[PDB]
Coordinates of C-alpha atoms (C1' of nucleotides) and ligand atoms in Angstrom, one line a residue:
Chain A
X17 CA -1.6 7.6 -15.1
X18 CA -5.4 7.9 -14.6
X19 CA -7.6 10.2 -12.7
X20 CA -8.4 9.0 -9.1
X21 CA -12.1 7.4 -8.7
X22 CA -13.5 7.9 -5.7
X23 CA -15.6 4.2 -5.6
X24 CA -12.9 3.4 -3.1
X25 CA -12.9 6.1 -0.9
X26 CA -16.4 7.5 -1.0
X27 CA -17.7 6.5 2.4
X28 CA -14.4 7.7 4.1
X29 CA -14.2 10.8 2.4
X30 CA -18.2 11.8 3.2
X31 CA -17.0 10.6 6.7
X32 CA -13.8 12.2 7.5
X33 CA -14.4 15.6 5.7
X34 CA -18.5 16.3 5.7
X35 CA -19.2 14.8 8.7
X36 CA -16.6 17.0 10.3
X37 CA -15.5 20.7 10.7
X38 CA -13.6 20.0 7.4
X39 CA -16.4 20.2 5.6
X40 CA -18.2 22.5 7.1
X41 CA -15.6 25.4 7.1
X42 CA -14.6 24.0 3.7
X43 CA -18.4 25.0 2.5
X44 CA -18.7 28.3 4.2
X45 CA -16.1 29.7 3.2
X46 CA -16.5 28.4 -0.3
X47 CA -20.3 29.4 -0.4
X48 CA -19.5 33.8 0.6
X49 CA -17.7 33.6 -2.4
X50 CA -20.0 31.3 -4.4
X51 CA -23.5 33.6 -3.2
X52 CA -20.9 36.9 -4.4
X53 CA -20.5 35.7 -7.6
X54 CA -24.3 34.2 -8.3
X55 CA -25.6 38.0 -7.1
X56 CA -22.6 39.9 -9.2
X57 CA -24.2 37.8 -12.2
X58 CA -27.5 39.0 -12.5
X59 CA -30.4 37.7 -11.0
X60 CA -31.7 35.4 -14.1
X61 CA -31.3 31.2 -13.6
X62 CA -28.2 30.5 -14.7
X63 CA -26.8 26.8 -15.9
X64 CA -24.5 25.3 -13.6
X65 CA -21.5 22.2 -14.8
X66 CA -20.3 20.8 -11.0
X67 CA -17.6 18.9 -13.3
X68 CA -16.4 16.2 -10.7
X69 CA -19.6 16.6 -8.5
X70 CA -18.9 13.9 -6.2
X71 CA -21.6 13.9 -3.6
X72 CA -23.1 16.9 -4.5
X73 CA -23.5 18.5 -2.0
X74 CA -22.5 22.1 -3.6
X75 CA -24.3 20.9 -6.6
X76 CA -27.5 20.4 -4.7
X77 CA -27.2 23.8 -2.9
X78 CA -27.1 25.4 -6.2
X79 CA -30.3 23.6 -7.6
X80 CA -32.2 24.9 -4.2
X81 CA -31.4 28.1 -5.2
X82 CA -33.3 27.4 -8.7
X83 CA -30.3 27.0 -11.1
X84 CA -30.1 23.8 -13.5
X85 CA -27.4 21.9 -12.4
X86 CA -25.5 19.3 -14.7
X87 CA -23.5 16.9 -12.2
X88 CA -21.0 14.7 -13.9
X89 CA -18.7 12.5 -12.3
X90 CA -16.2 9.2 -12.8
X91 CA -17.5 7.5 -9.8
X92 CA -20.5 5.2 -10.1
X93 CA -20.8 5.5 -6.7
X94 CA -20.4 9.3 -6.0
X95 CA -23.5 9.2 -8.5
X96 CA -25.9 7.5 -6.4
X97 CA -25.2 9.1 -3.4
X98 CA -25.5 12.4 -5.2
X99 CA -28.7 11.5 -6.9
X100 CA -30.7 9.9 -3.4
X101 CA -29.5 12.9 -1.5
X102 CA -31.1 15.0 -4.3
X103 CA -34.1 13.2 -4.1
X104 CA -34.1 13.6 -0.3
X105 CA -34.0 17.6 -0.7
X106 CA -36.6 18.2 -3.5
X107 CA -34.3 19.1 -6.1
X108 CA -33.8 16.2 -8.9
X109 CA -36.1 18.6 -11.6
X110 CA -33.4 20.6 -11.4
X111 CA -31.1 18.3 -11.7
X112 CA -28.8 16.2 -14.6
X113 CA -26.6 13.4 -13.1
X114 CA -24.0 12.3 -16.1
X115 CA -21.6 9.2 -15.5
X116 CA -18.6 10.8 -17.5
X117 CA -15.2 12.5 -16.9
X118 CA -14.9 15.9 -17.1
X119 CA -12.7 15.6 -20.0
X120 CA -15.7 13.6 -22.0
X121 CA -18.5 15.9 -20.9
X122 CA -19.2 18.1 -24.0
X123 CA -20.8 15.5 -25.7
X124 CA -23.6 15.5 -23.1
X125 CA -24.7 19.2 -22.9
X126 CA -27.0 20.9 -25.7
X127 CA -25.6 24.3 -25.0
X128 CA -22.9 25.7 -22.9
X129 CA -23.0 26.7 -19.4
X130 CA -23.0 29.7 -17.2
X131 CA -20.9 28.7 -14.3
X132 CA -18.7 25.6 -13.5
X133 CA -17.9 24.5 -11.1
X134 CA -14.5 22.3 -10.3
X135 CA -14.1 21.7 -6.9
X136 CA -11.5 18.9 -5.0
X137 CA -10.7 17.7 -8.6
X138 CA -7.9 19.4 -9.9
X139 CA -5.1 18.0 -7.4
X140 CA -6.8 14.8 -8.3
X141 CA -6.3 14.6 -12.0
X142 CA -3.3 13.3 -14.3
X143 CA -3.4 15.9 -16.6
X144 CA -5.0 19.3 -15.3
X145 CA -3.8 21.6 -18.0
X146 CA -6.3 19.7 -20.6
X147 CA -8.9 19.2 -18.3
X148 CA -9.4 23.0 -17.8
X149 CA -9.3 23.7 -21.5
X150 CA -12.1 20.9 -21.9
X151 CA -14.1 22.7 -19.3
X152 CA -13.2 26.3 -20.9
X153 CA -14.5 24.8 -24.5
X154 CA -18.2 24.3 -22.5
X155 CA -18.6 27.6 -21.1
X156 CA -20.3 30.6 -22.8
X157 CA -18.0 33.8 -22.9
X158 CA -18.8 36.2 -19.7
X159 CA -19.0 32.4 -17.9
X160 CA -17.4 32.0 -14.1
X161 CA -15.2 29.0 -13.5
X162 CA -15.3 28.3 -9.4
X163 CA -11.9 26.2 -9.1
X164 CA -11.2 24.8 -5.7
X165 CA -7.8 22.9 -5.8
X166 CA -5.3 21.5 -3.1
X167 CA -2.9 23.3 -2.1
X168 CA 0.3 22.0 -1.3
X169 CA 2.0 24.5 1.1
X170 CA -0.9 23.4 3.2
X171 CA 0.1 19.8 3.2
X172 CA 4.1 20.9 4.0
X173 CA 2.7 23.7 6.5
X174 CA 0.1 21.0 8.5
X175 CA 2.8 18.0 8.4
X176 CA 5.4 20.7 9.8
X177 CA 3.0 21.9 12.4
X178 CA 2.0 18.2 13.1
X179 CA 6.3 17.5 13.9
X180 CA 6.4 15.1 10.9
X181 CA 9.4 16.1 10.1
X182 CA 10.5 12.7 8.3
X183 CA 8.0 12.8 6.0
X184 CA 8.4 16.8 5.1
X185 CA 12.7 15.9 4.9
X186 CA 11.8 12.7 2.4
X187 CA 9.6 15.2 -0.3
X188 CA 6.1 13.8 1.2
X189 CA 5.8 11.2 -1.4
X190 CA 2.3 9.8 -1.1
X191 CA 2.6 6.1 -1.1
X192 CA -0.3 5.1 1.2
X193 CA -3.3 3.8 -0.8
X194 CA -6.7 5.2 0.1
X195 CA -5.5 7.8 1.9
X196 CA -7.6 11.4 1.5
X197 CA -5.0 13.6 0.7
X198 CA -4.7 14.1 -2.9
X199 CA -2.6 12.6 -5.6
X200 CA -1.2 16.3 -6.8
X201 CA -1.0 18.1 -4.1
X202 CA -0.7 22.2 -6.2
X203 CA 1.7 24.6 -6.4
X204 CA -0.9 27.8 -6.7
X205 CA 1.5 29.8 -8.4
X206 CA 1.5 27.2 -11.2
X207 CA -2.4 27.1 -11.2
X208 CA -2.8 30.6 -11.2
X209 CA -0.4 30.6 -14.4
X210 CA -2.3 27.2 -16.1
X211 CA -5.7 29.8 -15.9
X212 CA -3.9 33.2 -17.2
X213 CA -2.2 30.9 -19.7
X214 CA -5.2 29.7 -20.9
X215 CA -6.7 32.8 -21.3
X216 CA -9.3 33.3 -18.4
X217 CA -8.9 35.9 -16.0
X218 CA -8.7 35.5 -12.5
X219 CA -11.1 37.9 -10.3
X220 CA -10.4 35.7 -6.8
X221 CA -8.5 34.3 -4.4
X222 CA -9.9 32.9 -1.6
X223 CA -8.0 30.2 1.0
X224 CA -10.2 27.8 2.6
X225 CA -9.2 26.4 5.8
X226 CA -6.2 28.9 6.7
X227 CA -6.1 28.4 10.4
X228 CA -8.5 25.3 11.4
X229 CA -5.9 22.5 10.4
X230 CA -3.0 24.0 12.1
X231 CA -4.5 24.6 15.8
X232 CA -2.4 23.3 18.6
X233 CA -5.7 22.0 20.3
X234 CA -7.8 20.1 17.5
X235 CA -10.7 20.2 19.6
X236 CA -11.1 24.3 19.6
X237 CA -12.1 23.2 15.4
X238 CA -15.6 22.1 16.9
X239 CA -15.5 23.8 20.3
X240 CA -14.9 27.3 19.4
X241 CA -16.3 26.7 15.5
X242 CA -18.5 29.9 15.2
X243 CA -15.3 32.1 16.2
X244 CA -12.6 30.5 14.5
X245 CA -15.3 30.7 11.2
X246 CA -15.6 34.3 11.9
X247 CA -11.4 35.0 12.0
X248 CA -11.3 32.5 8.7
X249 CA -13.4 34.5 6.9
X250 CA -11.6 37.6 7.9
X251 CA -8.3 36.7 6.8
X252 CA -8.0 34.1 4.4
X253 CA -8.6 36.6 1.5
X254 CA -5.2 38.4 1.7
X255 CA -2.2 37.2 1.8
X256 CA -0.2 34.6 3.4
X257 CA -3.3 33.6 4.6
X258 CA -4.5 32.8 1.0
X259 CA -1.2 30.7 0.6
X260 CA -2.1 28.9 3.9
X261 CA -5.4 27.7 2.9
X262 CA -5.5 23.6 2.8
X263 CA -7.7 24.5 -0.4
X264 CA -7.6 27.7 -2.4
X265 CA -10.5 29.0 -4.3
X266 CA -9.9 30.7 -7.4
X267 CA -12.8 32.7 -9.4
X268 CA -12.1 33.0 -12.9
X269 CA -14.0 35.1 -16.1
X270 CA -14.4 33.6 -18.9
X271 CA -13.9 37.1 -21.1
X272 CA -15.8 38.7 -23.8
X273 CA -14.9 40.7 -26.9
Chain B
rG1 C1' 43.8 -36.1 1.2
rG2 C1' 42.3 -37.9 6.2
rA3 C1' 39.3 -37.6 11.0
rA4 C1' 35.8 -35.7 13.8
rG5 C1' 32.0 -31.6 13.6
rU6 C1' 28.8 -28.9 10.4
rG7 C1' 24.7 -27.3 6.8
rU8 C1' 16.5 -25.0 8.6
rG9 C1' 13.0 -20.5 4.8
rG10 C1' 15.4 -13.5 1.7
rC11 C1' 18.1 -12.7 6.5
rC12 C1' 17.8 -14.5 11.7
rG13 C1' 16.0 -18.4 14.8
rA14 C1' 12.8 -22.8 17.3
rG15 C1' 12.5 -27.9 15.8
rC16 C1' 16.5 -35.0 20.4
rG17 C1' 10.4 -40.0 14.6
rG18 C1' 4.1 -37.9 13.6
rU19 C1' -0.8 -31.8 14.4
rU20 C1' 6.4 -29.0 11.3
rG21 C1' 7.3 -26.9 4.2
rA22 C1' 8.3 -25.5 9.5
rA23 C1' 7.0 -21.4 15.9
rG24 C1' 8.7 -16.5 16.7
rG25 C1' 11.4 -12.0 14.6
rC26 C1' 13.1 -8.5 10.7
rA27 C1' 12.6 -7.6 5.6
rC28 C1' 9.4 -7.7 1.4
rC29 C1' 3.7 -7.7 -0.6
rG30 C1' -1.3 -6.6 0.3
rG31 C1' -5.4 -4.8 3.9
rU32 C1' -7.2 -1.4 8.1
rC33 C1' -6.0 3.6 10.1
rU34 C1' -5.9 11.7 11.0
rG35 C1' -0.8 13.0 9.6
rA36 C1' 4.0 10.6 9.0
rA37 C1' 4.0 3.0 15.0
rA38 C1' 0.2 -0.6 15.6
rC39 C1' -3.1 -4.5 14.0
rC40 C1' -4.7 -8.4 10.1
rG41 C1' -3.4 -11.7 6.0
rG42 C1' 0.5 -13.4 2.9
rC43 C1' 5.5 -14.3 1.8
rG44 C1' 11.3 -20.0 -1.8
rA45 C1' 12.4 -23.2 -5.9
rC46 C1' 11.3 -27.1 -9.0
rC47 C1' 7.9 -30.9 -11.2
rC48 C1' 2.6 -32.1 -12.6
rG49 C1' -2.2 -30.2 -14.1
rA50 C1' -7.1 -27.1 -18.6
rA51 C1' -8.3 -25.6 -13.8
rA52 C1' -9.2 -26.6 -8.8
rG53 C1' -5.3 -28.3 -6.8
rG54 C1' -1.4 -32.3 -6.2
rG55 C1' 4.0 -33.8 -5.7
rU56 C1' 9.2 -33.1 -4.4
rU57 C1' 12.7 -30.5 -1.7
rC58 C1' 15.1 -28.2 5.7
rC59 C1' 22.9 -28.9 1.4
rA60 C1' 21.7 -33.2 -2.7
rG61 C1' 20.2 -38.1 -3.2
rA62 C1' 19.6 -43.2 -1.5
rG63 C1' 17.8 -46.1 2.5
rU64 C1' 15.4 -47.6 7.6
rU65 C1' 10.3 -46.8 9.2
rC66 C1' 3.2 -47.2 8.9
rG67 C1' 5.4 -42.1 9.1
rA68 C1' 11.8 -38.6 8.3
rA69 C1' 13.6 -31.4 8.5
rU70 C1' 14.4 -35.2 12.9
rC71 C1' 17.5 -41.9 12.3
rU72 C1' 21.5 -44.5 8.9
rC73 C1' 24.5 -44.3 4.6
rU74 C1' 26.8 -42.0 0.0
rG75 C1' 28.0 -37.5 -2.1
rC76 C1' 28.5 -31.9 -2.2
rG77 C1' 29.9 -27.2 0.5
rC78 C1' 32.1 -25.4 4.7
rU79 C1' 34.9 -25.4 9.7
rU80 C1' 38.6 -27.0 12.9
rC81 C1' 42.5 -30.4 13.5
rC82 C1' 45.9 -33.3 11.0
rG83 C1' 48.4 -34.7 6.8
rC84 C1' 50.0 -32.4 2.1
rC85 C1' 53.4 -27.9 0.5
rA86 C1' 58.1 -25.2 2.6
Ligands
SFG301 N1 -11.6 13.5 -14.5 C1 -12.6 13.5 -13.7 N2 -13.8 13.8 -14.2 C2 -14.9 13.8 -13.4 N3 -14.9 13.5 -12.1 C3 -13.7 13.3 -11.6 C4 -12.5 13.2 -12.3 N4 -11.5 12.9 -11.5 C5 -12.0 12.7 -10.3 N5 -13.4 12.9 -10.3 C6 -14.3 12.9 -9.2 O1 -14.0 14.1 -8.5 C7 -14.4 14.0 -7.1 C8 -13.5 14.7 -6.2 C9 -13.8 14.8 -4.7 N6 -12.8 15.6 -4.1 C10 -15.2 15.4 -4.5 C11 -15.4 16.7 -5.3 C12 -16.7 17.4 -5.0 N7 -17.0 18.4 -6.0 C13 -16.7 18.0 -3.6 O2 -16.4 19.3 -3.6 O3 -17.0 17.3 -2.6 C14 -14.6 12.5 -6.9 O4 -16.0 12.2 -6.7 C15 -14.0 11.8 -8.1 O5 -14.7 10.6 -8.5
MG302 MG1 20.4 -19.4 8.6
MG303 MG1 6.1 -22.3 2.1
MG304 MG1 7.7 -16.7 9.5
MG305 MG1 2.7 -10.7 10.2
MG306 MG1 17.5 -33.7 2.4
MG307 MG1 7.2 -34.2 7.7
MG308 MG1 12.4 -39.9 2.4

RNA sequence: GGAAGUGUGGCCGAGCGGUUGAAGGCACCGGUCUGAAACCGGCGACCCGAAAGGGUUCCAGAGUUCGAAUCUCUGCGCUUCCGCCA
């Protein structure tokens, strides 16, 4: 079992989720916390990993705010689109594109990092528990690990709320090809154990997307987006609400002695 | 054993001499699609060939024909009737 390249899937995925409220909501939300964590850090330029950068779209929003940003990523294709999007905002100086998995990129920095970032990857990977000691072993101690998985009561709560009840009955298996919801759909009580396991300490949770997916009228995600942003970012740092999020943000400490 | 009748593709089902190795359907495989029907393409075996691809086979084979899934014959399996057995 390999990790899922997104060659295959790149257009539709830019498509269905940054071209839409999806997105959008997924980036606001993520980017309260993100801007919380770059202030509680001090104000010095930090070094950024976005292991699994894809597009780069978060990647590039760091480097406008003056960071160095390392992007590495499996997809050739993710690449490019990541490196003439750069281009088109200003920022390549800042910017290191590396054709490598996660799991391989050590051998490509000089020095460790301040802040990682792993976001949309870990529901997409055969073997997360390795992949977040890999990224662990780059990141100096006092480091912030941004981790952004998929969470799978979200996929049972949205295919309940959607009546496909089938599907929910049969365990969900995921048998349709090129479809965008993940390979590993998480269990965040299991994440949250693979990071305290592992030594790091978790100072975050965050859902992202508690309410948007599960509206009984679709359209009120684009009609009514400035309110339903302001009642997401109310609740969907307490719980259930956390546990509803289609994605869950975790913000994690690397510690010091 | 003897007639008649019968045998189409994985399963169904069109095909009363040619554009039918085979319509159409289900299944199975692949493709398209948020969030789990529809649409698109494919889809037996054996033989030949390095490959591209060619051949045979519509129970099996032989024949008639320019041409056979389609006509004739022989065999094989089945069905009914008879006969066998009692
Ligand atoms: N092991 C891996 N190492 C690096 N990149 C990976 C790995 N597995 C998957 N990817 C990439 O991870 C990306 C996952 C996507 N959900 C996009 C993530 C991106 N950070 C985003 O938030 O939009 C795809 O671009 C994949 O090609
Ligand atoms: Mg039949
Ligand atoms: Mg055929
Ligand atoms: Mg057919
Ligand atoms: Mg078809
Ligand atoms: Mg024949
Ligand atoms: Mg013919
Ligand atoms: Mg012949």
């Amino acid at each position: 079992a390999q990790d899922r390249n997104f060659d295959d899937i790149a257009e539709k995925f830019s498509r269905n989720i940054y071209g839409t409220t999806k997105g959008q909501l997924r980036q606001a939300i993520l980017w309260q916390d993100l801007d919380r964590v770059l202030a509680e850090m001090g104000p010095q330029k930090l070094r950024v990993l976005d292991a699994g950068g894809g597009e780069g779209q978060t990647a590039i929003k760091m480097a406008e705010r003056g960071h160095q940003v390392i992007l590495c990523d499996l997809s050739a294709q993710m690449i490019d689109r990541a490196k003439q999007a750069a281009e088109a905002k200003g920022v390549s100086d800042n910017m290191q594109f590396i054709h490598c998995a996660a799991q391989d990129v050590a051998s490509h920095l000089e020095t460790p990092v301040d802040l990682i970032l792993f976001h949309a990857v870990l529901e997409w990977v055969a073997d997360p528990r390795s992949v977040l000691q890999t990224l662990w072993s780059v990141l100096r101690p006092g480091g912030v690990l941004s981790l952004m998985f998929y969470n799978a009561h979200g996929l049972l709560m949205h295919n309940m709320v959607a009546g496909n009840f089938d599907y929910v009955q049969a365990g969900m298996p995921k048998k349709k090809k090129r479809t965008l919801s993940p390979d590993y759909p998480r269990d965040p009580a299991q994440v949250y154990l693979w990071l305290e396991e592992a030594g790091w300490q978790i100072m975050g949770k965050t859902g992202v997307r508690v309410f948007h997916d599960y509206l009984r009228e679709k359209h009120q995600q684009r009609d009514c987006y400035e309110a339903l942003l302001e009642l997401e970012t109310r609740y969907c740092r307490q719980e259930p609400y956390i546990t509803l999020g289609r994605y869950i943000h975790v913000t994690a400490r690397k510690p010091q002695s």
